[PDB]
Amino acid sequence: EYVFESPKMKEILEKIKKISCAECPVLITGESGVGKEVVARLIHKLSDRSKEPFVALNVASIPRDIFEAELFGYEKGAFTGAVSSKEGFFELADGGTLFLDEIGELSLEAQAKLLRVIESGKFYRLGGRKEIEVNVRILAATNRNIKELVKEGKFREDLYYRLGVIEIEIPPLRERKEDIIPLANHFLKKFSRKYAKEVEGFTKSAQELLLSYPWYGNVRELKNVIERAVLFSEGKFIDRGELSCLV
Amino acid sequence: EEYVFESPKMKEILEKIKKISCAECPVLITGESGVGKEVVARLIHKLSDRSKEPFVALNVASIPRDIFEAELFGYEKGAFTGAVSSKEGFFELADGGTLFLDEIGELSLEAQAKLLRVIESGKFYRLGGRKEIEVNVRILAATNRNIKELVKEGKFREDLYYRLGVIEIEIPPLRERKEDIIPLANHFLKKFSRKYAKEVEGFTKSAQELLLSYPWYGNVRELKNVIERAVLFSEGKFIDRGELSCLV
Amino acid sequence: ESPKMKEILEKIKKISCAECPVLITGESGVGKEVVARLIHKLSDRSKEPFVALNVASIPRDIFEAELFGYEKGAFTGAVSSKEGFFELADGGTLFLDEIGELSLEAQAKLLRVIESGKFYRLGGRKEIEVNVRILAATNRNIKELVKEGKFREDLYYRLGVIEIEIPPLRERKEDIIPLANHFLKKFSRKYAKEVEGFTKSAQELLLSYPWYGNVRELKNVIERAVLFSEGKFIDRGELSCLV
Amino acid sequence: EEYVFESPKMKEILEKIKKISCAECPVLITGESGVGKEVVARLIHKLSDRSKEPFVALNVASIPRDIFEAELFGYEKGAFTGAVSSKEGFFELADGGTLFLDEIGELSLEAQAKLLRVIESGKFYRLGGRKEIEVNVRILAATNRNIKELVKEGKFREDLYYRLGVIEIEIPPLRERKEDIIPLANHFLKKFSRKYAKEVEGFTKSAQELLLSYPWYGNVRELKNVIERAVLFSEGKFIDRGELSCLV
Amino acid sequence: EEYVFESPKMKEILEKIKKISCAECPVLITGESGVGKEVVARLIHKLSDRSKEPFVALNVASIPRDIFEAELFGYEKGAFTGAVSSKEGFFELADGGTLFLDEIGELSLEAQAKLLRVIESGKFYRLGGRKEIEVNVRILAATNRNIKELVKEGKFREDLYYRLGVIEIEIPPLRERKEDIIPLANHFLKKFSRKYAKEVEGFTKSAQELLLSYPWYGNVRELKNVIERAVLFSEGKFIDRGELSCLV
Amino acid sequence: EEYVFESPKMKEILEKIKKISCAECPVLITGESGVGKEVVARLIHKLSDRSKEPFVALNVASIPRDIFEAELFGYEKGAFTGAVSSKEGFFELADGGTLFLDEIGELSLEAQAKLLRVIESGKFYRLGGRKEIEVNVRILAATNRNIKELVKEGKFREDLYYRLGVIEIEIPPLRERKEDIIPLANHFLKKFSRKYAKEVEGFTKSAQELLLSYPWYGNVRELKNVIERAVLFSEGKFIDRGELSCLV
Amino acid sequence: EYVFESPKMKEILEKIKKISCAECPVLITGESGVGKEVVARLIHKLSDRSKEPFVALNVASIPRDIFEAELFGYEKGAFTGAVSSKEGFFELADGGTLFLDEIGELSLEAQAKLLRVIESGKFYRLGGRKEIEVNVRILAATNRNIKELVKEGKFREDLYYRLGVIEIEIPPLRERKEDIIPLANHFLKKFSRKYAKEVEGFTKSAQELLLSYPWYGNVRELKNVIERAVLFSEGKFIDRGELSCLV
Numbered sequence A, G: 001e002y003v004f005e006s007p008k009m010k011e012i013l014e015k016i017k018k019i020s021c022a023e024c025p026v027l028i029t030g031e032s033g034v035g036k037e038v039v040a041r042l043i044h045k046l047s048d049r050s051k052e053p054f055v056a057l058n059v060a061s062i063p064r065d066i067f068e069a070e071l072f073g074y075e076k077g078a079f080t081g082a083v084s085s086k087e088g089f090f091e092l093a094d095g096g097t098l099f100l101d102e103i104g105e106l107s108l109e110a111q112a113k114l115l116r117v118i119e120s121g122k123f124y125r126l127g128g129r130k131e132i133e134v135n136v137r138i139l140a141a142t143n144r145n146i147k148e149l150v151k152e153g154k155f156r157e158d159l160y161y162r163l164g165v166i167e168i169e170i171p172p173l174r175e176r177k178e179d180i181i182p183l184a185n186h187f188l189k190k191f192s193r194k195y196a197k198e199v200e201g202f203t204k205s206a207q208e209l210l211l212s213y214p215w216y217g218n219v220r221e222l223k224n225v226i227e228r229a230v231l232f233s234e235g236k237f238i239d240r241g242e243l244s245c246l247v
Numbered sequence B, D, E, F: 001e002e003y004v005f006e007s008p009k010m011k012e013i014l015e016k017i018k019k020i021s022c023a024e025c026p027v028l029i030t031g032e033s034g035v036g037k038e039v040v041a042r043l044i045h046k047l048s049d050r051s052k053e054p055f056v057a058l059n060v061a062s063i064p065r066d067i068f069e070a071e072l073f074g075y076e077k078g079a080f081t082g083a084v085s086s087k088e089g090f091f092e093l094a095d096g097g098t099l100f101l102d103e104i105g106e107l108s109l110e111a112q113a114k115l116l117r118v119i120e121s122g123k124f125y126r127l128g129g130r131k132e133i134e135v136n137v138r139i140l141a142a143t144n145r146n147i148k149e150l151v152k153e154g155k156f157r158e159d160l161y162y163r164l165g166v167i168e169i170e171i172p173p174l175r176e177r178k179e180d181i182i183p184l185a186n187h188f189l190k191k192f193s194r195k196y197a198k199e200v201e202g203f204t205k206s207a208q209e210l211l212l213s214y215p216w217y218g219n220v221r222e223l224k225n226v227i228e229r230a231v232l233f234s235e236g237k238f239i240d241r242g243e244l245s246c247l248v
Numbered sequence C: 001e002s003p004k005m006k007e008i009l010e011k012i013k014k015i016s017c018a019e020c021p022v023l024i025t026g027e028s029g030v031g032k033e034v035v036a037r038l039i040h041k042l043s044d045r046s047k048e049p050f051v052a053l054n055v056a057s058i059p060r061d062i063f064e065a066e067l068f069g070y071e072k073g074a075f076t077g078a079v080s081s082k083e084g085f086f087e088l089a090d091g092g093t094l095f096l097d098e099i100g101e102l103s104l105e106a107q108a109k110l111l112r113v114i115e116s117g118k119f120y121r122l123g124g125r126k127e128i129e130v131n132v133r134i135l136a137a138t139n140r141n142i143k144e145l146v147k148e149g150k151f152r153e154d155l156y157y158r159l160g161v162i163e164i165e166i167p168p169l170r171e172r173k174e175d176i177i178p179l180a181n182h183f184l185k186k187f188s189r190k191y192a193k194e195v196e197g198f199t200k201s202a203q204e205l206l207l208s209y210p211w212y213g214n215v216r217e218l219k220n221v222i223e224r225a226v227l228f229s230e231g232k233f234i235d236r237g238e239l240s241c242l243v
């Protein structure tokens, strides 16, 4: 039950419905805390392979050394800390969608490998000899500006274009004020039920504030700001009171 | 007897703790050295649902940056010359209970990440390989530095900030909680006057005003030590500008 | 269908029935691979395997390693012997994409093989023997690198025997439109779209557009159009905006 | 055999040492390289309520920085390297007794931090261990460097000092306690005389003076050292400028 | 195979390569990339008292510095390689044989020295070892650099230089051996015309002259190839300015 | 063999030696390069209560700083990077005898520090060991730098200098002992005249004046060599102004 | 038949003869290939222990971190792999002449430890505990200027001077013209016999050329450049033309 009631969002939602029934890689960009994952997540549930696996893996939480192998996999002989070939996530999510967060953290080496896989659907295991071919619906995401990284020499130009087929720009909460009040209201519901609190909703005075806050964290920060406000809540409503504590 | 909270902003912070009771979202505590951060964590946990459960407090500074990512989590055998057994973890020891990471800013980028992954997934692996353990530990970070700043310095992962920034408590230095200095004074005095066996009863309007004026840069940490001293050299029941001045 | 590619299809044809290395120069996306991939199909060995490896998808140091194989502990971390991608491609054809990334050593080793067929698994004492069809394809200006001492002179020359310079799409106008269709046909065919073709309206911005990304960017831009396509045709609208 | 406390300050200190011994907070001893800082500590122990309990004393610079925390708190099976046995770390070795940490300023911020915790909690985890060890250690801190200076350079944990600077004892150099120079000189004279089997009964006043006109950059240490040197080169029953002048 | 030594100097070199045939004194060969050094080495081998013996030939440039010494001198167990049992090395491989070092210039310094010994004593130390390995190797080396300036530049050990150089052979470039050009040219053509099965027989005075003219900076190597190309793009029975110009 | 002390200060030392050879305190022999600094400690041995005990003489500079602590105090088991067995530190070697550290100038601030302990407590720990070994070694510290300076620079623990200073003993260059110079010059010419079987008995009057002028910066040693050469190129029964000239 | 028929050379030959009878260190300087090792070798053939072992050893071709251990030997445990206890070349050379060549390479700690041997004649087997005592006649040599080095702080001093005692300076052949022509004939004669060649000598034309060459490779270039000429030799002699190809 995810929210979509703003401008550029009820539009993106469409773009999702139209895309899903595709098989080319989608690229998602935006500031951390806008939906990227969610969006990617949906682009899956609607996709013709919704029932298929959704291997969503973070690129910033993984040692570069592990990742490159964690993803494509290895073969006895390239890893001196493990002997036995484990299938990379690619083979794991065979026929499924593979979402990589913060793409902008892929090795100039990983990226290359990636490209070859987006197009041929083929690749070699790390230290592999047999060409493994699979069926993965890649879903890039990132908070960083690729085009800027492309010039810095920190990212493959030809990898970007191939992902730029379907690109989705997620604008920050601060530019979807039509989302703050609905989302917030989502959250206030989640938590009010999660911590068994008789909290029904925000007051006008409060609703205003929520709309004025810049929400740097965006959707994320609001998620927290309200779990926090739900707990701090004393009566049935929330206004300038608990909120100001934060926002 | 009891503990000490009486100034408005703290009269408050106690409650915030009380409300947070029924929760488990990580908590980010911040105040100058000595302000009572680690005293709040401890209280948050005494109040959380898992009070009876363990409290695994670990100073992130009390361990060389190169061995933190070996003791917090754990260690998979033969990955570093000499391993008597894949190393357990403070995370694993704190499983089911609280894990109070003190002085967060002192986390290596590598672990800052590795923590994030465990704050969301809750699963972790000791070194290279995969997760094979289940840990249910409530994160409680406390730092005396300003997190936000560190974020523009790149020394602190932002996403890890907002993740711990679910509930955020900020302890104001003693010098702003003046209503606390005095009451916090007799608590201590009374404490050592016991442990140390001195007929000390209290302070003199003389000294009190002194205390209530001193800035206490190691707020409360200082106030505790200062007074532990002032009691040791006590002859008369009361303590005045005399025993404090030559010290403060 | 072109002023230079309808010609190249002949050099390829007049070559395939050969056995020496074929350099393939041109910007990113012209078809450097396709050509080679092709060159193979027409080669006396097209029935053999076509090992295709992206020089830059494997860490510099760890290359000669892979590409030429090593024995047991011939170095840092090598548990058990391995086969050089070359060997894998014995009899078949090897395609080294972006020859520009080969360490001055890899080059050094490459050459010797291309000139003797014999080499030494990295850290090996028996000389292995092979017959492989080398298909090099960079997008850089080797001749420069050579000067900047960033590439071996002699290596170039030996590869430069059969050089096939693929000009961009901004120099093959003849190919912009025929291709654009080829993509629309397949993309329409795949994404259940009732699209027939372009309107001279879009066929204009098309043949005009710089196409720095070459045939690839196109094979992309189109797929984007075929998706964001509505009716049966496309025009300045779809093509403009996101492109 | 005995001890020399005949100046104004020392005999004053020999009295604060008494008022303390019957306590248990950490005491920080400052003073140049020779004022007999250890001694003053060992004495506060021979008057303390655990005087029969052990007196663990270690030289903070006699163990490489890296092994220290490990040594000071111990470890078990495993650790970054070479750790293969359990060493209950010095601390425990003195549980109930007294720990003399020689020249603090050499501690690593890690150790400083880890220590500061033990001082207050009295509990700590073996490096690489999983059990919360508890001990009742009397920590006596001594250093020849100026801590406060160090705090500025950020070469020393602030709050650690405040935690040790409870009981601070400033032991001046010899060249400021003159009153002891001769009483002392005698003491060493008696001793080394006995020790080396000599007929040395005193110093001429020719010498009695050299000894007062020396800065003794090695307060007491250098004294004791000079004298013994003398008593050996001595010939008569009295030692005068003649023998000393070679040295002092 | 037929060797094209039909020039005034090359015809002379060959004699040298012959007069030199009866010894084992190291040989240093110098010339541009492709004037056929390895050839002249190979030939030096084929005419040497140890022709029916090995001829190991590695290209210093082909081996990354990380592994070369180890690749050339082998290593002993527990070598600086983090691997088990001892690997022999190209030197031993060439035992009794003739080792050919191509492009001597890239030889590391520590390397050149080691090499310097083997040339004298015939002994060397498996990387990270102790036993002293002896080998009866004939050394033929060559490079496309002018040594002296590397000796001067202090990039190439001096003494070393004066050690191989017992016998030195200068292989001029093609541009100074026009007498080889044409003959070479044919042999190549005859060789390719066959291998590829064509009807082409020779070159026209038209082209013959272009060939004699061209500078040939890729030396013989480019020749063999430029022609292999022609023989490829050959239609008629004779190759003339027509094809030769479409390239060179 | 033959001692040589006819000179005011030498002769005085020789006595300082003797008065000392009845004590087990640390003798900090001071002095230039080749002023007999060794002989002196060898002598302070031949006359000590343990002249029969071992005289362990180890050059604190012929042993690399990292392995120093190793060989000195000793090692336990696989403690450091390259440990295979339980080996005995040098101290132990000389247990009941004398450990003569030639030039404590080069002592890792750790060694120095770790050296102190041994000096006083007579006990020490084997690097990486748990047991506290104890020995009674007579330490003969022979530097040749100005310790006091090093102490300033910080390059020498201050309390170490004071623990070896108990009997400092300067040693005057040869330029400040013209008395020995010619005796020595003779004590040698003899030996070497014998050893090399030369019919040379002594120097001319001319000669000896030089042997007096010359400032022998290389001192006694300096002389020894220089006479040996002389004795060797010697012709007549006399070595005159000449022989000692073109070499001085 | 070793050559010594010129001024400074016939002179040094007299210094060698007197020396030999003497077990003292002897330093040897000169450019690469003047005869240092030859001299070092003669000082031994003439010493009162010529019948003894002459441990010549190349310092540069020996892993710096093994030298000492090689030199002084080691006792078990000395390092990982120290199974038994080997005994350095010193004990190898005992009773005779060891000969470090190019001294300037010893490590500081090496030069130190080296020293005490010169004086005491004792040294400690790496990680050893007993004093090993040998009777070796060190015969250092070098090509670098030690003096200059000491300054830089690369080479201990005492060791410098300790060896300085009898220092021998071999002069470049570019100053021993009198030796040239003689060396040549001895050389030609040699190879001319090793390869069964009809060579008898050189022509005035040749000779003059010789004596005109700087011989940067001093005596050790002349040795090659004659083996070369002796081979390429056609008739009975050798003139400008054959040596010009080299010189």
Ligand SMILES: Nc1ncnc2c1ncn2[C@@H]1O[C@H](COP(=O)(O)OP(=O)(O)O)[C@@H](O)[C@H]1O
Pocket: A001, A002, A003, A004, A030, A031, A032, A033, A034, A035, A036, A037, A038, A039, A183, A186, A219, A220, A223
């Ligand atoms: N559009 C949305 N509607 C409701 N909740 C959302 C929405 N977007 C994000 N969230 C919530 O906010 C958090 C931010 O999630 P995420 O998708 O990972 O952000 P990002 O854009 O950085 O990838 C999620 O845990 C999710 O539950």
Ligand SMILES: Nc1ncnc2c1ncn2[C@@H]1O[C@H](COP(=O)(O)OP(=O)(O)O)[C@@H](O)[C@H]1O
Pocket: B003, B004, B005, B031, B032, B033, B034, B035, B036, B037, B038, B039, B040, B184, B220, B221, B224, D120
């Ligand atoms: N509000 C308080 N009431 C009573 N004691 C307190 C209070 N705050 C701090 N203290 C005392 O002050 C000391 C400093 O505690 P701590 O919170 O751990 O420091 P920090 O805030 O830097 O982590 C504790 O030993 C505790 O007993």
Ligand SMILES: Nc1ncnc2c1ncn2[C@@H]1O[C@H](COP(=O)(O)OP(=O)(O)O)[C@@H](O)[C@H]1O
Pocket: C026, C027, C028, C029, C030, C031, C032, C033, C034, C035, C137, C179, C182, C215, C216, C219
């Ligand atoms: N001549 C062509 N005909 C049809 N499609 C082409 C042609 N040339 C290139 N393409 C398309 O453009 C892409 C360029 O591919 P590739 O072989 O990798 O060339 P390059 O190595 O120059 O980038 C291919 O995926 C292919 O579908």
Ligand SMILES: Nc1ncnc2c1ncn2[C@@H]1O[C@H](COP(=O)(O)OP(=O)(O)O)[C@@H](O)[C@H]1O
Pocket: D002, D003, D004, D005, D031, D032, D033, D034, D035, D036, D037, D038, D039, D040, D184, D187, D219, D220, D221, D224, F159
């Ligand atoms: N007041 C004193 N009376 C007798 N001896 C003393 C006195 N003070 C110091 N000493 C002696 O002086 C030397 C200095 O000792 P120490 O306590 O270790 O000083 P510090 O720790 O300041 O360097 C010791 O031998 C000690 O026993």
Ligand SMILES: Nc1ncnc2c1ncn2[C@@H]1O[C@H](COP(=O)(O)OP(=O)(O)O)[C@@H](O)[C@H]1O
Pocket: C115, E002, E003, E004, E005, E031, E032, E033, E034, E035, E036, E037, E038, E039, E040, E220, E221, E224
């Ligand atoms: N004299 C010659 N006769 C016939 N072929 C030659 C001759 N010289 C060189 N070649 C050929 O020319 C190419 C250049 O070879 P190579 O000996 O490796 O040159 P270089 O060592 O100078 O780099 C080789 O393929 C070789 O077979």
Ligand SMILES: Nc1ncnc2c1ncn2[C@@H]1O[C@H](COP(=O)(O)OP(=O)(O)O)[C@@H](O)[C@H]1O
Pocket: F002, F003, F004, F005, F031, F032, F033, F034, F035, F036, F037, F038, F039, F040, F184, F187, F220, F221, F224
């Ligand atoms: N007093 C002396 N009488 C005879 N020989 C001496 C005397 N003092 C020193 N020597 C000789 O001088 C040399 C220098 O010896 P040493 O004591 O080791 O110098 P230092 O220890 O100062 O560096 C030795 O050969 C030693 O035998």
Ligand SMILES: Nc1ncnc2c1ncn2[C@@H]1O[C@H](COP(=O)(O)OP(=O)(O)O)[C@@H](O)[C@H]1O
Pocket: G001, G002, G003, G004, G030, G031, G032, G033, G034, G035, G036, G037, G038, G039, G219, G220, G223
């Ligand atoms: N005086 C000489 N008499 C005969 N041969 C000599 C003489 N000097 C040098 N040589 C020869 O020249 C070569 C150079 O020898 P060497 O002394 O080792 O040079 P370096 O000065 O570098 O040590 C030797 O192999 C030797 O045969």
